């Protein structure tokens, strides 16, 4: 009955096909749990048992739980995750008409693995910006249905397929969405127009621009003979968003708690401007920050039994082995002996197994940070694999971290 955390992750993933949808999903959960939306344009009146959230660009979210003592005296407990994932995005003048098809040109967002996007039943979702009633508006759309596919070329016509080839993103990625009669005109913006109507019944004067991503229509799922795994797109990093949320809503204590889920992690001012607004002027920010810690959550690489030499022999985390503390001496404000020690101890105290990762050696707010993540395979594929046990481990330790009244 971490069956429930896992079911919740699956539903969150299905409701979050783009960073915008992930943000709106997080906002629903928070609104249902009593968090008040603050608007950055307004002056804020916050207080000591207060429960708040704020968004920017409708794609980034910070949730705030103010406790009994002020951040000056007790610091903030912060958990960081991200709302974006590497994917394929529709270009601005996208219509491609060849060999009787309609295709949409795509931009590669983040460091996607290309090959797995092929031969998948894809749909399309995101923000559309348009003019209605002489004013500018945006809405989210999700076609939902499998409207697109990027087919492989038959091995018969590419006989060295398995020997590998540099996949050209410009040429081989544009998905097929339909057939066109000769020579029907193709207007993608008209299709968005229809979709706005069908989904929200709005009648746009003109559709201006959009940020739309393809995504797999096949749901995340528990896989394995004995259900040891979860497979799904966007585990990087919606897995961590979900954990951080579950921990935030359920944590005990009365500490000052922050969940930051930022867009564009795959491509700082937001967090800073928000935290400063919760404190007096002067030395209070710097002083509260020096009593704070950030648990920066972002999936780690499990050691893959078919590519085991890609890991250091002594640092191969296992799926269902718990969260992984990520060490890289070549970063500032990364894991250090103090932030790692704190976090490792926190796991021991909660009886949550915990692991370590560094790489093979041949391969700003100023807050103390520990970098952790759940171990996974196939990072940046359209379908990643995590352990089915690990989400409950992370939720527990993050709960203890938010309830934790003393920091190092």
Question: Within positions 32 to 51, which residues make up the interface with a copy of itself, using CB under 8 A?
Answer: 40-44
Cβ-based neighbour number of residue 255 at 10 Å:
23
Residue showing the smallest CB distance to Zn ion in the complex = 236
133 binds, among Zn ion, a copy of itself, none (CB under 5 to 8 A by kind): none
Structure tokens at 298: 């972002």
Question: In the set 166, 181, 183, 185, which binds a copy of itself (CB under 8 A)?
Answer: 166
For residues 369 and 360, give the distance between their C-alpha atoms in angstroms, rounded to a whole number.
Answer: 22
Bond into 237 cis (ω within 30): yes
**Residues in binding contact with a copy of itself, number by CB under 8 A:** 159
Q: Is residue 211 near Zn ion by the rule CB under 5 A?
A: no
Q: Is 336 in the site for a copy of itself (CB under 8 A)?
A: yes
Concatenated DSSP letters of 53-103: EEEETTTEEEEEE--SS-HHHH-EEEEEEES---EEEEEEEEEEEETTEEE
Rule CB under 8 A: say whether 174 interacts with a copy of itself. Answer: yes
Question: Nearest approach, Cβ of 253 to a copy of itself (angstroms)?
Answer: 18
Q: How far is the CB of 250 from a copy of itself (least distance, A)?
A: 25
Cβ distance 257 to 64 under 8 Å?
yes
Q: Is 64 among the residues that bind a copy of itself (CB under 8 A)?
A: no
Q: Which is nearer to a copy of itself, 136 or 185 (CB)?
A: 136
165: tokens are 């080839």
Q: Residue 387 and residue 392: Cα distance in Å, rounded?
A: 10
Q: How far apart are CA 271 and CA 40, in angstroms?
A: 12
Q: Within positions 89 to 128, which residues make up the interface with a copy of itself, using CB under 8 A? A: 89, 91-96, 98-103, 105-116, 118-121, 126-128
Asked if residue 155 binds a copy of itself (CB under 8 A), the reply is yes
Distance separating alpha carbons of residues 53 and 35, to the nearest angstrom: 6
State which residue, 251 or 365, has the beta carbon closest to a copy of itself: 365
| 280 token code pair | 């007096």
Q: Contacts with a copy of itself in 233-262 (CB under 8 A)? A: none
Stretch that binds a copy of itself, among 29-37, 161-169, 243-251, 396-404 (CB under 8 A): 161-169
The H-or-E segment that residue 97 falls in is strand 87-98
Distance CA 98, CA 96 (A): 6
To a copy of itself, the closest distance from the beta carbon of 24 in angstroms equals 15
Task: Closer to a copy of itself by CB, 51 or 264: give it.
Answer: 264
Spell out, one character per residue from 234 to 253, where the chain touches Zn ion: x when CB under 5 A holds, - when not: --x-----------------
């Amino acid at each position: 009955m971490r069956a429930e955390l896992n079911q919740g992750l699956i539903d969150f993933l299905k409701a979050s096909p783009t960073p915008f949808h992930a943000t709106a999903s997080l906002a629903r959960r928070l609104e249902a749990a009593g968090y008040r939306r603050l608007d950055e344009r307004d002056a804020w009146h916050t207080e000591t048992g207060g429960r708040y959230y704020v968004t920017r660009n409708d794609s980034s979210l910070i949730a705030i739980r103010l406790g009994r003592r002020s951040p000056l005296e007790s610091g903030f407990r912060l958990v960081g995750a991200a709302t974006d994932s590497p994917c394929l995005r529709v270009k601005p003048n996208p219509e491609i008409a060849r060999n009787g098809f309609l295709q949409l040109g795509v931009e590669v967002y983040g460091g996607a693995l290309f090959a797995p996007w092929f031969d998948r039943d894809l749909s399309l979702a995101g923000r559309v910006t348009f003019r209605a009633n002489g004013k500018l508006e945006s809405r989210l759309v999700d076609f939902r249905k499998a409207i697109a596919v990027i087919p492989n070329l038959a091995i018969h016509l590419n006989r060295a397929a398995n020997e590998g080839w540099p996949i050209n993103a410009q040429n081989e990625l544009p998905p097929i969405i339909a057939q066109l009669a000769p020579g029907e005109a193709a207007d993608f913006r008209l299709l968005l127009d229809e979709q706005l109507l069908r989904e929200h019944g709005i009648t746009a004067d003109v559709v201006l621009d959009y940020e739309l991503s393809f995504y797999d229509t096949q749901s995340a799922a528990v896989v394995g003979l004995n259900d040891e795994f979860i497979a799904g797109a966007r585990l990087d990093n919606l897995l961590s968003c979900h954990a951080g949320l579950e921990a935030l809503l359920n944590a005990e204590g009365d500490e000052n708690c922050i969940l930051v889920c930022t867009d564009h992690e795959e491509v700082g001012p937001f967090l800073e401007q928000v935290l400063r607004r919760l404190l007096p002027e002067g030395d209070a920010f710097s002083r509260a920050i020096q009593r704070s810690l950030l648990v920066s959550a972002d999936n780690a690489h499990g050691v893959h039994p078919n590519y085991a030499d890609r890991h250091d022999a002594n640092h191969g985390p296992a799926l269902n082995g718990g969260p992984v503390i990520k060490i890289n001496s070549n970063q500032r404000y990364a894991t250090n002996s103090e932030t790692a020690g704190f976090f490792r101890h926190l796991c021991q105290d909660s009886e949550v197994p915990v692991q370590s990762f560094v790489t093979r050696s041949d391969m700003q707010v100023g807050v103390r940070t520990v970098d952790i993540g759940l171990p996974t395979f196939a990072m940046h594929s359209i379908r990643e694999l995590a352990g089915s046990h690990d989400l409950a481990h992370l939720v527990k330790v993050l709960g203890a971290f938010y309830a934790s009244s003393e920091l190092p």
